[PDB]
């Protein structure tokens, strides 16, 4: 059944790979360096997403218990509670938010199988990771773009899974900053500044906002309603952009790398079907994203959590 977890390194040394002020032009050499430096961390997230996927699929306690064993090792190791090393930007910080997103969701998914010793071992670790990612945004010179929405998702999943009301509320605030920034356009000013990756970054911003709204929904809260379903304008801007990038081309003045919408469609489809405009993207599934919690198709259809 359960293979030996990989080691849990305390430091992250990730590398930024955009050459230009707009962060739209990839230096292939730096991109390869960042891929190689983050491979073990990505493998851990992919694995913990998948083993928690398996437990959601057929309620097999072996799947959950292996997930819990893997999380408990990195908890015991104090994985990613060391130094976030800056090479040429904050890539190490972003990577810890994506990692917390992956590990916190996996934990939530298998939480109902967690015994008191497992809870007691994992919760403190997730709470420390969440509090450290929050420390990163106590600085007002750090512009709250999609990175803050990715930060929020892990903080929030942590708040829900470990029942910490303060982290839950900090998560909500991150969500609320995103919804507040949505123009009547459906655009996000800080994402419109990312040249040929504006459409990519509208998709990439919307995705953690949708997953955060799905976590609120597990507590019977409707955050999608906020500012008259402002999120719907962004959902509709992105999916239009995937069939035809004229609007973003005109409004960024920059030819848009084509986009296929990511697995936020699988949830949002069910909440606001908006004439079926999300079904073409739905057809291309299933959608796997460890940093969104894993198999989004599976979670939207049967639930993020097996028992409320």
Author numbering: 22 to 329
Publication passage describing the model:
We used the tetra unit of HA [NAG (+2) (3←1) BDP (+1) (4←1) NAG (−1) (3←1) BDP (−2)] for cocrystallization with inactive mutant H168A at pH 5.0. After solving the structure, we found a significant region of diffuse electron density within the active site, but we did not observe any specific, resolvable interactions with water or other solutes. Furthermore, we were unable to model an individual sugar unit within the region of diffuse electron density, as it was not large enough to accommodate a pyranose ring including its substituents. Since we know the specific region within the tunnel that corresponds to polysaccharide binding from our high-resolution ManA-complexed enzyme structures, we performed docking studies for tetra unit of HA by taking the protein coordinates of wild-type Smlt1473 bound to tetra-ManA at pH 5. Specifically, we used the Rosetta flexible ligand protocol to generate a large number of possible models, and by utilizing scoring parameters we were able to find the most plausible tetra-HA-docked structure.
